[PDB]
């Protein structure tokens, strides 16, 4: 470690911690920057040499973390948590968690290489027919979104899960062991316990389970209504009205958002078409327009525009030179208070416009907290970070807003149009909830050893069936590693944040809508141009992780806890409608034929 980056001496006291945190921040930006930069260079241009550079950068970060971590423990391990300065306690608490820097050098290098190889496998996996091969984004994504051929959907689903998941399994086992070895040295029973600790709630798992109990009936009704729609297209051979839905038929590789099958389920087809994708295409929208439109919503609230560095540095389309890249959308803070970027293989669709807002929400958070101490440059919890852009996107997707931006000519305000809109939003928001909940239940079980390698797939599918009510369309066994075919697993990005965000965003939306002076139905609120809503949101953003999330939330929405009631209020009309429709249609709610799997197509896979 460069002498300039090494820790000096400080008194074994609070006033010493302060000068310590200051000296840390002075070097930590440089170390954070070099790491993020090396990661960027790799993720926008996956080469062996870029992976090598990224591993060396990670090693340097671990040296830094070890040196500053050991020093924090040297001076404070017996005494440290009684500091009067709460922000200083949070800074120190973070510095002293070494994580993978607890590993001896050889195991650090093993750990860093496993992360690089898992990233490479996921982001370069292909499905091959011909000598021609399909990438996940855009090719397989487009098949899942727009093919209605059971056999073709099956080819893409099986192809992807086999190509990504199978080779990842042995690496993921090794990663899990090393990760646990690392975090056990910080005092945590396993890595999952460390991830859950970010929510600073002793009742976190119970609180989540109680939220889900309130949400589950909404999902069960949406599921039954959708299953019926699919039965009408695919027939009795491929859809069991009392069994799980085949996992490839819901518009999305993970069945996690069902927005792409909106045309099959839309209750009132003769009302305005709320999927504006075809209008974006007809109008000639490109990625640049989508980002500028998202930016203008932020500036309408008197939040910050995207800086020149963002426009100059970002990767907003998949490179056309055919470079391998990580296409999964992400937002980047380089920790130098200047560089902030999005890396997105943007496609011209309505859902992608939502994703642009999601990512830009991350960037806005970064811009607003850039001057806090580097340890406090995080969301009040990770769920807050995931919610910011989604909240704006709730206003953007309203038929009233879409009209304002030239994407929906017809204006209607009637009960059928409301049901259509709420059903569309339910396909995006309600359909996700079981998935958002289950992914880290799976991973917490892996980290804890409740799910050893011999049960990775068995337990994955148990949870997928339990929560989502889906089944794999071909037989799976433990050679398969279907959890690994979801970005966040090989890229070691925690998932519970998304479940938390999907609840939180409605709490935020309700609060901002009230602040805006809006007095109509919550689902028709548009906060566009509300500088009062902007100011309330800015308060959250500027806090970073400097204060307890429960207090930040209380200041914002008037309650110190996650609460499903705003989500339930938002969806109330369609919740009631779906329940009525399912009863009238004689549906079974749930999937009591839990063993059921669809047959294979007759000529599969030939053709
Ligand atoms: C992608 O990464 C590679 C390195 O892994 C870059 O290749 C280097 O490019 C620089 C500047 O053009 C050269 O001077 C080196 O000789 C190159 N090294 C190798 C190993 O080829 C490549 O330029 C990067 N491409 C993009 C588009 O950023
Ligand atoms: C796991 O499954 C692998 C391939 O799937 C199998 O063959 C396809 C065509 C289907 O018939 C499917 O039902 C079968 O499971 C096998 O190559 C592999 O042997 C299986 N793993 C173990 C340990 O048996
Ligand atoms: Cl999280
Ligand atoms: Zn995000």
UniProtKB/Swiss-Prot annotation:
Domain Peptidase M2: 11-592
Site, as annotated: Not glycosylated: 491
Post-translational modifications: Phosphorylated on tyrosine residues on its extracellular part, promoting cleavage by secretase enzymes and formation of the soluble form (Angiotensin-converting enzyme, soluble form).
Glycosylation sites: 9, 25, 45, 82, 117, 286, 413, 477
Binding sites annotated in the UniProt record for Zn(2+) 1: 358, 362, 386
Tissue expression pattern: Ubiquitously expressed, with highest levels in lung, kidney, heart, gastrointestinal system and prostate.
Gene Ontology terms: cellular component: endosome; external side of plasma membrane; extracellular exosome; extracellular region; extracellular space; lysosome; plasma membrane
tRNA-binding recorded as keyword: no
Disulfide bonds: 128-133, 327-345, 513-525
Subcellular location, record wording: Cell membrane; Cytoplasm
Keywords (A to Z) from UniProt: Calmodulin-binding, Carboxypeptidase, Cell membrane, Cytoplasm, Disulfide bond, Glycoprotein, Hydrolase, Membrane, Metal-binding, Metalloprotease, Phosphoprotein, Protease, Repeat, Secreted, Signal, Transmembrane, Transmembrane helix, Zinc
Disease connection: Ischemic stroke: A stroke is an acute neurologic event leading to death of neural tissue of the brain and resulting in loss of motor, sensory and/or cognitive function. Ischemic strokes, resulting from vascular occlusion, is considered to be a highly complex disease consisting of a group of heterogeneous disorders with multiple genetic and environmental risk factors.
Subunit structure: Monomer and homodimer; homodimerizes following binding to an inhibitor. Interacts with calmodulin (CALM1, CALM2 or CALM3); interaction takes place in the cytoplasmic region and regulates phosphorylation and proteolytic cleavage.
Functional note: Dipeptidyl carboxypeptidase that removes dipeptides from the C-terminus of a variety of circulating hormones, such as angiotensin I, bradykinin or enkephalins, thereby playing a key role in the regulation of blood pressure, electrolyte homeostasis or synaptic plasticity. Composed of two similar catalytic domains, each possessing a functional active site, with different selectivity for substrates.
Additional free-text comment from the UniProt record: Inhibitors of ACE are commonly used to treat hypertension and some types of renal and cardiac dysfunction.
The protein's name in its UniProt record: Angiotensin-converting enzyme
Organism: Homo sapiens
Encoding gene (name): ACE
């Amino acid at each position: 470690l460069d002498p300039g980056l090494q820790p000096g001496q400080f008194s074994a006291d609070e006033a010493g911690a302060q000068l310590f945190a200051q000296s840390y921040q002075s070097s930590a930006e440089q170390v954070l920057f070099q790491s993020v930069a090396a990661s960027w260079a790799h993720d926008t241009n996956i080469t062996a040499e870029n992976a090598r550079r990224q591993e060396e950068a990670a090693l340097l970060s671990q040296e830094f973390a070890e040196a500053w971590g050991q020093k924090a423990k040297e001076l404070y391990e017996p005494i440290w948590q009684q500091f009067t300065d709460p922000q200083l306690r949070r800074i120190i608490g973070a510095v002293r968690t070494l994580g993978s820097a607890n590993l001896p050098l050889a195991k650090r290098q093993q750990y860093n290489a496993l992360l690089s190889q898992m990233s490479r496998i996921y982001s370069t996996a292909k499905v091959c027919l011909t000598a021609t091969c399909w990438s996940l984004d855009p090719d397989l994504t487009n098949i899942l979104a727009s093919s209605r051929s059971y056999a073709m959907l099956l080819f893409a689903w099986e192809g992807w899960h086999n190509a990504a998941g199978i080779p990842l399994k042995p690496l993921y086992e090794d990663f899990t062991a090393l990760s646990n070895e690392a975090y056990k040295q910080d005092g945590f029973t396993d890595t999952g316990a460390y991830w859950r600790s970010w929510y600073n709630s002793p009742t976190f798992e119970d609180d989540l389970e109680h939220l889900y109990q309130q949400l589950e009936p909404l999902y069960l009704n949406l599921h039954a209504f959708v299953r019926r729609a699919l039965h009408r297209r695919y027939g009795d051979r491929y859809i069991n009205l009392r069994g799980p839905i085949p996992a490839h038929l819901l518009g999305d590789m993970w069945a996690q958002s069902w927005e792409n099958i909106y045309d099959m389920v839309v209750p009132f087809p003769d009302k305005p078409n709320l999927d504006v994708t075809s209008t974006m295409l007809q109008q000639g929208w490109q990625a640049t327009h989508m980002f500028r439109v998202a930016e203008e919503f932020f500036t309408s609230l008197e939040l910050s525009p995207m800086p020149p560095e963002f426009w100059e540095g970002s990767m907003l389309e998949k490179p056309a030179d055919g470079r391998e890249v990580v296409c999964h959308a992400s937002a980047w803070d380089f920790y130098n208070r200047k560089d902030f970027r999005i890396k997105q293989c943007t496609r011209v669709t309505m859902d992608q416009l939502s994703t642009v807002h999601h990512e830009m929400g991350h960037i806005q958070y970064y811009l607003q907290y850039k001057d806090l101490p580097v340890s406090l440059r995080r969301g009040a919890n990770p769920g807050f970070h995931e919610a910011i852009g989604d909240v704006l996107a709730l206003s953007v997707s309203t038929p009233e807003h879409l009209h304002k931006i030239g994407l929906l000519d017809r204006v209607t305000n009637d009960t059928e149009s409301d049901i259509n809109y709420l059903l569309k939003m339910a396909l995006e928001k309600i359909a996700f909830l079981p998935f958002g909940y289950l992914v880290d239940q799976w991973r917490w079980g892996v980290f804890s050893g409740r799910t050893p390698p011999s049960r990775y797939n068995f337990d994955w599918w148990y949870l997928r069936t339990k929560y989502q009510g889906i089944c794999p369309p071909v037989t799976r066994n433990e050679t398969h590693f279907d959890a690994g075919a979801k970005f966040h697993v090989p890229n070691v990005t925690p998932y519970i944040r998304y479940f938390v965000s999907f609840v939180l965003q409605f709490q935020f939306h309700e609060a901002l809508c009230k602040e805006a002076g809006y007095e109509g139905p919550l689902h028709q609120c548009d906060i566009y141009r509300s500088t009062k809503a902007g100011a309330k949101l800015r308060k959250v953003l500027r806090a970073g992780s400097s204060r307890p999330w429960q207090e930040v939330l209380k200041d914002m929405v008037g309650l110190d806890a996650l609460d499903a009631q705003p989500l339930l209020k938002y969806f109330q009309l369609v919740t009631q409608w779906l329940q009525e429709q399912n009863q009238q249609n004689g549906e079974v709610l749930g999937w009591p034929e839990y063993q059921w799997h669809p047959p294979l197509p007759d000529n599969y896979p030939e053709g």
